[PDB]
Design a protein around this ligand. Sequence first.
Ligand SMILES: COC[C@H]1CC[C@@H]2/C1=C\[C@@]1(C)CCC(C(C)C)=C1[C@@H](O[C@@H]1O[C@@H]3COC(C)(C)O[C@H]3[C@H](O)[C@H]1O)[C@H](O)[C@@H]2C
Ligand SMILES: COC[C@H]1CC[C@@H]2/C1=C\[C@@]1(C)CCC(C(C)C)=C1[C@@H](O[C@@H]1O[C@@H]3COC(C)(C)O[C@H]3[C@H](O)[C@H]1O)[C@H](O)[C@@H]2C
Ligand SMILES: [Mg+2]
Lengths: 9, 11, 229, 230
Amino acid sequence: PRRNTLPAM
Amino acid sequence: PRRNTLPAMDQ
Amino acid sequence: DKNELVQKAKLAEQAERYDDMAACMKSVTEQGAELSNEERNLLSVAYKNVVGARRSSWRVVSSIEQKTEGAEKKQQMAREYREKIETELRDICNDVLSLLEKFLIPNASQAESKVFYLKMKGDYYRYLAEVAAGDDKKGIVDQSQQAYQEAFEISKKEMQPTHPIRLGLALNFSVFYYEILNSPEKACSLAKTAFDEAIAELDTLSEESYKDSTLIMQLLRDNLTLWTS
Amino acid sequence: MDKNELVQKAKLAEQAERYDDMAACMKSVTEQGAELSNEERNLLSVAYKNVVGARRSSWRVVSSIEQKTEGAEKKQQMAREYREKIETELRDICNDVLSLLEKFLIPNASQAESKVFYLKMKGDYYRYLAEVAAGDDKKGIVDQSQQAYQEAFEISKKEMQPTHPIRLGLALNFSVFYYEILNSPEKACSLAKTAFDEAIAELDTLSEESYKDSTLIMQLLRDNLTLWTS
Ligand SMILES: COC[C@H]1CC[C@@H]2/C1=C\[C@@]1(C)CCC(C(C)C)=C1[C@@H](O[C@@H]1O[C@@H]3COC(C)(C)O[C@H]3[C@H](O)[C@H]1O)[C@H](O)[C@@H]2C
Ligand SMILES: COC[C@H]1CC[C@@H]2/C1=C\[C@@]1(C)CCC(C(C)C)=C1[C@@H](O[C@@H]1O[C@@H]3COC(C)(C)O[C@H]3[C@H](O)[C@H]1O)[C@H](O)[C@@H]2C
Ligand SMILES: [Mg+2]
């Protein structure tokens, strides 16, 4: 998967 | 569920 | 410059920047030579995404306008925003229809091309009909119908019944009968006959396009099942 | 067009997925100069995240194509020039947001929660500029991101409970800044692990209004930990 940041699209 | 037409935006 | 514009279009496509993709394909069309199959399909995908974003937004807002019946301020905001989306939608269909009328339809030298662009002419008039109301709506519905009918004649005379363009035309023309002409029997008849004619001649499928053909057959039958039930 | 009306138009634009329009409405709301409500800030953040994120996504695809076109000079030059056009769009967007944050949002934030929200956003938009920077230019931009994130980190640790969604979201993104921008897998993991461990020890502090966001971010924190320890 990809690493997460927030906010997301 | 929607009726289909072609082309679609996605594919 | 031609081959360059097509490269930039495919880069735009990869980047999902469909406005850029459409601008590149518009430039190519306006140079005046018939489009190859690849160029024609790029032009189609580009404008389907550009117009379809507005069509999707228009349905959402139009559903909101309908849900806020009796909340005047909200319904007025939705109505004004729907109007703004429509002007964009109209400008985009007018662009495409102008390309088809000036370049694509008159330079089309093969039946397959002629059908593809007349179908596209029917599609974009149908989109204009979706957001037309009152006086001009009749003439727009008429132009959509006359383009599809011409494509439909040519395709029955020249194309195998499993040809994806012939099947895609049947799919969209039957939707036009269902949604624009409010004629479900006619829409069901057109879709069922295209399905049945293709079933009868599966030996006309080719290695190259059978996947597109069998997919459209499935969509025609899905519309029939949605519309019968 | 008054503030509440702009906000309703912004919400309409969001349902329509017209994020350009959504951002323009929220920019107008910010420019009226009053502190934003929680709902306003959230709508501002979603709007500009979609606007910039489209360009981040395109940039990644075009730069990747640029790299595989070594030896095909017309193809490479075209993808380069397209990457640069995209890059200038993305920069313009980040600069718009950063200007709003410096002029209106950060100086006016009266509560610690808003202060941290905007400092985190400052940190994120410099981080996006850092993704697309080179040189001594890059080092300055990385430093501005790090500083905004660090100040938000300090205020939140002092002022906000461990399960507060803004505190968690700050940890998540600062941790990514460490991993991806500063190149420290170790420090990114530590920040994420401690944020997750501290909030999981204090569930009882969740409220019906905050539990959905806080538990989602916790999950994303652990997901990054799982990713980075594979
Ligand atoms: C400056 O950085 C702000 C980040 C950090 C954490 C998070 C942020 C953003 C949004 C606005 C982005 C995603 C998100 C949560 C879904 C985790 C929030 C925020 O929550 C929400 O606003 C949301 C608007 O988007 C949707 C998906 C509709 O969900 C809403 C919630 O219901 C509301 O609580 C969350 O509370 C906080 C403010
Ligand atoms: C004027 O209306 C033209 C419609 C109706 C028939 C259909 C049309 C469009 C596209 C261009 C739209 C969806 C589609 C499907 C049947 C796969 C096609 C067409 O095929 C494809 O172009 C595709 C691009 O999208 C992907 C997913 C890459 O698939 C490619 C195929 O492989 C290619 O054959 C299809 O052959 C024909 C031309
Ligand atoms: Mg707590």
